[PDB]
Enzyme design. Structure first.
Site, mmCIF file in Angstrom:
data_model
loop_
_atom_site.group_PDB
_atom_site.id
_atom_site.type_symbol
_atom_site.label_atom_id
_atom_site.label_comp_id
_atom_site.label_asym_id
_atom_site.label_seq_id
_atom_site.Cartn_x
_atom_site.Cartn_y
_atom_site.Cartn_z
ATOM 1 N N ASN A 1 112.568 -72.851 1.787
ATOM 2 C CA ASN A 1 113.233 -73.650 0.739
ATOM 3 C C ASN A 1 112.776 -75.103 0.874
ATOM 4 O O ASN A 1 112.175 -75.383 1.966
ATOM 5 C CB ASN A 1 114.671 -73.405 0.862
ATOM 6 C CG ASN A 1 115.427 -74.008 -0.435
ATOM 7 O OD1 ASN A 1 114.723 -74.134 -1.426
ATOM 8 N ND2 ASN A 1 116.729 -73.860 -0.383
ATOM 9 N N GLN B 1 113.765 -81.981 -0.937
ATOM 10 C CA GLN B 1 113.559 -82.582 -2.489
ATOM 11 C C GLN B 1 114.487 -83.773 -2.856
ATOM 12 O O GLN B 1 114.050 -84.334 -3.607
ATOM 13 C CB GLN B 1 113.270 -81.456 -3.340
ATOM 14 C CG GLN B 1 114.598 -80.617 -3.603
ATOM 15 C CD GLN B 1 114.385 -79.352 -4.273
ATOM 16 O OE1 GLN B 1 113.745 -78.337 -4.007
ATOM 17 N NE2 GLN B 1 114.908 -79.680 -5.809
ATOM 18 N N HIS C 1 114.344 -71.634 -9.596
ATOM 19 C CA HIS C 1 113.856 -72.270 -8.415
ATOM 20 C C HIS C 1 112.700 -71.603 -7.623
ATOM 21 O O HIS C 1 112.483 -70.503 -7.554
ATOM 22 C CB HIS C 1 115.205 -72.170 -7.475
ATOM 23 C CG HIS C 1 115.015 -72.895 -5.914
ATOM 24 N ND1 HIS C 1 115.105 -74.260 -6.108
ATOM 25 C CD2 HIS C 1 115.113 -72.551 -4.903
ATOM 26 C CE1 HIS C 1 114.855 -74.609 -4.845
ATOM 27 N NE2 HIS C 1 115.107 -73.600 -4.181
ATOM 28 N N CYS D 1 110.950 -78.488 -6.593
ATOM 29 C CA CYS D 1 111.034 -77.419 -5.971
ATOM 30 C C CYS D 1 109.704 -76.734 -6.151
ATOM 31 O O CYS D 1 109.013 -76.151 -5.228
ATOM 32 C CB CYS D 1 111.936 -76.443 -6.191
ATOM 33 S SG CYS D 1 112.060 -75.942 -8.120
HETATM 34 C C1 LIG Z 1 115.546 -78.795 -14.598
HETATM 35 C C2 LIG Z 1 115.367 -78.795 -13.236
HETATM 36 C C3 LIG Z 1 114.692 -78.003 -12.675
HETATM 37 C C4 LIG Z 1 114.435 -78.139 -11.117
HETATM 38 C C5 LIG Z 1 113.744 -77.065 -10.261
HETATM 39 C C6 LIG Z 1 113.836 -77.250 -8.965
HETATM 40 C C7 LIG Z 1 114.268 -75.602 -8.489
HETATM 41 O O1 LIG Z 1 113.865 -78.046 -8.038
HETATM 42 N N1 LIG Z 1 112.580 -76.400 -10.727
HETATM 43 C C8 LIG Z 1 112.746 -75.289 -11.395
HETATM 44 C C9 LIG Z 1 111.577 -75.037 -11.862
HETATM 45 C C10 LIG Z 1 111.114 -73.783 -12.668
HETATM 46 C C11 LIG Z 1 112.025 -72.714 -12.828
HETATM 47 N N2 LIG Z 1 110.320 -74.305 -13.573
HETATM 48 C C12 LIG Z 1 110.831 -74.929 -14.660
HETATM 49 O O2 LIG Z 1 112.087 -74.973 -14.651
HETATM 50 C C13 LIG Z 1 110.105 -75.560 -15.438
HETATM 51 C C14 LIG Z 1 110.767 -76.737 -16.053
HETATM 52 C C15 LIG Z 1 109.879 -77.729 -16.985
HETATM 53 C C16 LIG Z 1 108.443 -77.281 -17.036
HETATM 54 C C17 LIG Z 1 108.138 -76.518 -16.526
HETATM 55 C C18 LIG Z 1 108.904 -75.535 -15.846
HETATM 56 C C19 LIG Z 1 110.070 -73.347 -11.480
HETATM 57 C C20 LIG Z 1 110.376 -72.692 -10.240
HETATM 58 C C21 LIG Z 1 108.950 -72.011 -12.157
HETATM 59 N N3 LIG Z 1 110.763 -75.972 -11.398
HETATM 60 N N4 LIG Z 1 111.515 -76.930 -10.934
#
Ligand SMILES: C/C=C/C[C@H](C(C)=O)n1cc([C@@](C)(NC(=O)c2ccccc2)C(C)C)nn1
Length: 218
Positions: free
Chosen positions: A185, A20, A165, A26
Protein backbone atom coordinates in the site's frame (compact mmCIF):
# COMPACT_ATOMS: atom_id res chain seq x y z
CA UNK A 1 4.71 -25.33 -12.15
CA UNK A 2 4.04 -22.10 -10.21
CA UNK A 3 5.61 -21.66 -6.77
CA UNK A 4 3.21 -22.04 -3.85
CA UNK A 5 4.36 -18.67 -2.58
CA UNK A 6 6.14 -15.63 -3.90
CA UNK A 7 7.51 -12.54 -2.22
CA UNK A 8 9.26 -10.08 -4.53
CA UNK A 9 10.76 -8.28 -1.54
CA UNK A 10 13.01 -11.33 -1.14
CA UNK A 11 14.42 -10.64 -4.60
CA UNK A 12 15.10 -6.99 -3.87
CA UNK A 13 12.47 -5.84 -6.37
CA UNK A 14 10.32 -3.75 -4.03
CA UNK A 15 11.21 -0.25 -2.86
CA UNK A 16 10.35 1.29 0.49
CA UNK A 17 6.69 1.86 1.26
CA UNK A 18 5.65 5.40 0.41
CA UNK A 19 3.17 7.73 2.09
CA UNK A 20 0.73 9.42 -0.26
CA UNK A 21 -0.66 11.75 2.40
CA UNK A 22 -3.71 13.83 1.49
CA UNK A 23 -3.20 13.46 -2.28
CA UNK A 24 -5.15 10.69 -4.05
CA UNK A 25 -2.06 9.37 -5.81
CA UNK A 26 -2.40 5.65 -5.03
CA UNK A 27 -2.70 4.99 -8.76
CA UNK A 28 0.68 6.63 -9.34
CA UNK A 29 2.33 4.72 -6.51
CA UNK A 30 0.87 1.47 -7.79
CA UNK A 31 2.18 2.19 -11.28
CA UNK A 32 5.69 3.18 -10.23
CA UNK A 33 5.89 0.21 -7.88
CA UNK A 34 5.22 -2.19 -10.71
CA UNK A 35 7.77 -0.47 -12.94
CA UNK A 36 10.37 -0.37 -10.14
CA UNK A 37 10.37 -4.16 -10.05
CA UNK A 38 10.83 -4.41 -13.81
CA UNK A 39 13.69 -1.91 -13.63
CA UNK A 40 15.42 -4.03 -10.99
CA UNK A 41 14.88 -7.18 -13.03
CA UNK A 42 16.34 -5.57 -16.16
CA UNK A 43 19.17 -3.45 -14.74
CA UNK A 44 19.90 -4.99 -11.33
CA UNK A 45 19.25 -1.63 -9.64
CA UNK A 46 16.42 -0.91 -7.24
CA UNK A 47 15.36 2.71 -7.64
CA UNK A 48 12.24 4.49 -6.42
CA UNK A 49 10.48 6.13 -9.35
CA UNK A 50 8.63 9.41 -9.31
CA UNK A 51 4.95 9.11 -8.47
CA UNK A 52 4.91 12.92 -8.58
CA UNK A 53 6.04 12.80 -12.21
CA UNK A 54 2.86 10.82 -12.94
CA UNK A 55 0.62 13.10 -10.89
CA UNK A 56 1.92 16.21 -12.63
CA UNK A 57 2.46 14.88 -16.17
CA UNK A 58 0.15 11.91 -16.78
CA UNK A 59 -2.86 14.17 -16.70
CA UNK A 60 -5.90 14.96 -18.90
CA UNK A 61 -4.56 13.29 -22.05
CA UNK A 62 -4.35 10.07 -20.00
CA UNK A 63 -7.75 10.46 -18.32
CA UNK A 64 -6.07 11.16 -15.00
CA UNK A 65 -6.73 13.83 -12.42
CA UNK A 66 -3.56 13.93 -10.33
CA UNK A 67 -4.39 14.09 -6.64
CA UNK A 68 -8.00 13.29 -7.56
CA UNK A 69 -7.17 9.94 -9.08
CA UNK A 70 -6.00 8.18 -12.19
CA UNK A 71 -5.36 4.84 -13.91
CA UNK A 72 -2.26 2.68 -13.57
CA UNK A 73 -2.60 1.58 -17.19
CA UNK A 74 -2.75 5.09 -18.59
CA UNK A 75 0.17 6.01 -16.34
CA UNK A 76 2.13 3.24 -18.05
CA UNK A 77 1.11 4.60 -21.43
CA UNK A 78 2.33 8.05 -20.41
CA UNK A 79 5.70 6.57 -19.51
CA UNK A 80 5.81 4.87 -22.91
CA UNK A 81 4.72 8.02 -24.77
CA UNK A 82 7.06 10.20 -22.76
CA UNK A 83 10.01 7.85 -23.27
CA UNK A 84 10.79 7.96 -19.58
CA UNK A 85 9.95 8.60 -15.97
CA UNK A 86 12.19 10.42 -13.52
CA UNK A 87 13.51 9.02 -10.27
CA UNK A 88 11.76 9.80 -7.02
CA UNK A 89 14.97 11.43 -5.76
CA UNK A 90 15.04 13.82 -8.74
CA UNK A 91 11.32 14.58 -8.79
CA UNK A 92 10.16 14.18 -5.22
CA UNK A 93 6.66 13.57 -3.98
CA UNK A 94 4.89 16.63 -2.61
CA UNK A 95 1.32 15.29 -2.27
CA UNK A 96 -0.09 18.05 -4.44
CA UNK A 97 -0.79 18.81 -8.08
CA UNK A 98 2.10 20.65 -9.71
CA UNK A 99 3.12 21.73 -13.17
CA UNK A 100 4.81 18.98 -15.15
CA UNK A 101 8.54 19.17 -14.46
CA UNK A 102 9.70 16.02 -16.22
CA UNK A 103 13.33 16.24 -17.32
CA UNK A 104 15.03 13.49 -19.31
CA UNK A 105 18.31 14.20 -17.48
CA UNK A 106 16.67 12.61 -14.43
CA UNK A 107 15.16 9.64 -16.26
CA UNK A 108 15.47 6.46 -14.23
CA UNK A 109 13.19 4.10 -16.17
CA UNK A 110 11.40 3.56 -19.44
CA UNK A 111 8.39 1.45 -20.34
CA UNK A 112 7.79 -0.24 -23.70
CA UNK A 113 4.41 -1.86 -23.08
CA UNK A 114 1.92 -2.93 -20.47
CA UNK A 115 -0.44 -5.83 -20.11
CA UNK A 116 -3.89 -5.93 -18.57
CA UNK A 117 -4.88 -9.29 -17.12
CA UNK A 118 -8.32 -10.79 -17.68
CA UNK A 119 -10.99 -9.69 -15.28
CA UNK A 120 -11.32 -11.56 -11.98
CA UNK A 121 -8.92 -14.37 -12.82
CA UNK A 122 -6.89 -15.03 -9.69
CA UNK A 123 -5.08 -17.95 -11.30
CA UNK A 124 -3.86 -15.70 -14.10
CA UNK A 125 -2.85 -13.07 -11.55
CA UNK A 126 -0.90 -15.74 -9.66
CA UNK A 127 0.94 -16.71 -12.85
CA UNK A 128 1.79 -13.07 -13.59
CA UNK A 129 3.05 -12.41 -10.07
CA UNK A 130 5.21 -15.56 -10.24
CA UNK A 131 6.51 -15.15 -13.78
CA UNK A 132 6.50 -11.44 -14.59
CA UNK A 133 6.76 -9.51 -11.32
CA UNK A 134 4.62 -7.32 -9.05
CA UNK A 135 1.26 -6.43 -10.55
CA UNK A 136 -0.65 -3.18 -10.22
CA UNK A 137 -4.19 -3.77 -9.00
CA UNK A 138 -7.25 -2.00 -7.79
CA UNK A 139 -8.99 -3.02 -4.59
CA UNK A 140 -12.09 -2.08 -2.67
CA UNK A 141 -10.44 -0.37 0.28
CA UNK A 142 -13.53 1.60 1.35
CA UNK A 143 -14.51 -0.51 4.32
CA UNK A 144 -13.57 0.61 7.82
CA UNK A 145 -11.86 -2.74 8.47
CA UNK A 146 -9.31 -2.02 5.73
CA UNK A 147 -7.91 1.03 7.49
CA UNK A 148 -7.63 -0.91 10.75
CA UNK A 149 -5.87 -3.97 9.35
CA UNK A 150 -2.88 -4.99 11.47
CA UNK A 151 -2.12 -8.63 10.76
CA UNK A 152 -3.34 -11.98 9.47
CA UNK A 153 -5.20 -12.35 6.20
CA UNK A 154 -7.74 -9.66 5.46
CA UNK A 155 -11.21 -10.93 4.73
CA UNK A 156 -14.14 -8.50 4.78
CA UNK A 157 -17.59 -9.94 4.03
CA UNK A 158 -18.77 -6.46 2.99
CA UNK A 159 -16.06 -6.15 0.35
CA UNK A 160 -17.11 -5.72 -3.25
CA UNK A 161 -15.51 -5.94 -6.66
CA UNK A 162 -15.97 -2.18 -7.07
CA UNK A 163 -12.38 -1.01 -6.73
CA UNK A 164 -11.43 2.43 -5.40
CA UNK A 165 -7.79 2.11 -4.45
CA UNK A 166 -4.63 1.33 -6.41
CA UNK A 167 -2.05 -0.93 -4.81
CA UNK A 168 0.68 -3.39 -5.79
CA UNK A 169 0.59 -7.15 -5.48
CA UNK A 170 4.17 -8.14 -4.65
CA UNK A 171 3.55 -11.75 -3.76
CA UNK A 172 1.19 -14.43 -2.58
CA UNK A 173 1.15 -17.34 -0.19
CA UNK A 174 -0.71 -19.02 2.61
CA UNK A 175 -0.80 -18.14 6.28
CA UNK A 176 -2.44 -20.49 8.75
CA UNK A 177 -4.56 -22.13 6.09
CA UNK A 178 -5.59 -18.83 4.48
CA UNK A 179 -4.36 -18.07 0.99
CA UNK A 180 -3.41 -14.45 0.51
CA UNK A 181 -2.13 -11.83 -1.87
CA UNK A 182 0.74 -9.74 -0.49
CA UNK A 183 -0.19 -6.14 -1.15
CA UNK A 184 2.04 -3.07 -0.93
CA UNK A 185 0.00 0.00 0.00
CA UNK A 186 1.01 3.70 -0.11
CA UNK A 187 -0.25 4.88 3.28
CA UNK A 188 3.21 4.65 4.82
CA UNK A 189 4.77 2.11 7.16
CA UNK A 190 2.10 2.79 9.86
CA UNK A 191 -0.48 1.03 7.77
CA UNK A 192 -0.92 -2.71 8.26
CA UNK A 193 2.26 -4.76 8.45
CA UNK A 194 4.93 -2.16 7.73
CA UNK A 195 2.83 -0.80 4.88
CA UNK A 196 1.60 -4.16 3.59
CA UNK A 197 -1.66 -6.05 3.82
CA UNK A 198 -2.26 -9.71 3.15
CA UNK A 199 -5.58 -9.93 1.34
CA UNK A 200 -7.69 -13.06 0.87
CA UNK A 201 -6.78 -15.05 -2.23
CA UNK A 202 -9.00 -17.49 -4.12
CA UNK A 203 -12.01 -16.23 -2.17
CA UNK A 204 -14.06 -15.12 -5.14
CA UNK A 205 -11.96 -12.16 -6.28
CA UNK A 206 -12.14 -10.74 -2.80
CA UNK A 207 -12.27 -6.91 -2.72
CA UNK A 208 -11.81 -6.95 -6.50
CA UNK A 209 -8.10 -7.65 -6.19
CA UNK A 210 -8.03 -9.44 -9.58
CA UNK A 211 -10.57 -7.18 -11.25
CA UNK A 212 -8.12 -4.81 -12.93
CA UNK A 213 -4.52 -6.07 -12.82
CA UNK A 214 -1.77 -4.75 -15.06
CA UNK A 215 1.99 -4.81 -15.28
CA UNK A 216 4.48 -2.87 -17.37
CA UNK A 217 7.58 -4.08 -19.13
CA UNK A 218 10.72 -2.02 -19.63
C1 LIG B 1 -11.17 10.60 -5.88
C2 LIG B 1 -9.85 10.24 -5.23
C3 LIG B 1 -9.28 9.07 -5.49
C4 LIG B 1 -7.97 8.79 -4.80
C5 LIG B 1 -7.33 7.47 -5.13
C6 LIG B 1 -6.49 6.89 -4.26
C7 LIG B 1 -6.83 5.52 -3.78
O1 LIG B 1 -5.53 7.48 -3.78
N1 LIG B 1 -7.50 6.90 -6.35
C8 LIG B 1 -8.49 5.87 -6.66
C9 LIG B 1 -8.05 5.76 -8.08
C10 LIG B 1 -8.67 4.82 -9.07
C11 LIG B 1 -9.89 4.08 -8.50
N2 LIG B 1 -9.04 5.66 -10.21
C12 LIG B 1 -9.95 6.65 -10.19
O2 LIG B 1 -10.60 6.89 -9.18
C13 LIG B 1 -9.83 7.69 -11.23
C14 LIG B 1 -10.13 8.90 -10.95
C15 LIG B 1 -10.02 9.85 -11.89
C16 LIG B 1 -9.62 9.54 -13.05
C17 LIG B 1 -9.29 8.34 -13.29
C18 LIG B 1 -9.43 7.42 -12.41
C19 LIG B 1 -7.60 3.80 -9.52
C20 LIG B 1 -7.04 2.92 -8.39
C21 LIG B 1 -8.06 2.93 -10.69
N3 LIG B 1 -7.05 6.51 -8.53
N4 LIG B 1 -6.66 7.26 -7.41
Amino acid sequence: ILPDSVDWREKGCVTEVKYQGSCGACWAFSAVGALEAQLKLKTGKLVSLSAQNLVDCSTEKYGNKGCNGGFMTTAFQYIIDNKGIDSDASYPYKAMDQKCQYDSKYRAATCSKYTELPYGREDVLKEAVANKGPVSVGVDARHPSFFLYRSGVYYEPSCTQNVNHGVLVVGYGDLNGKEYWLVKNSWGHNFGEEGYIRMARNKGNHCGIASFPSYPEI
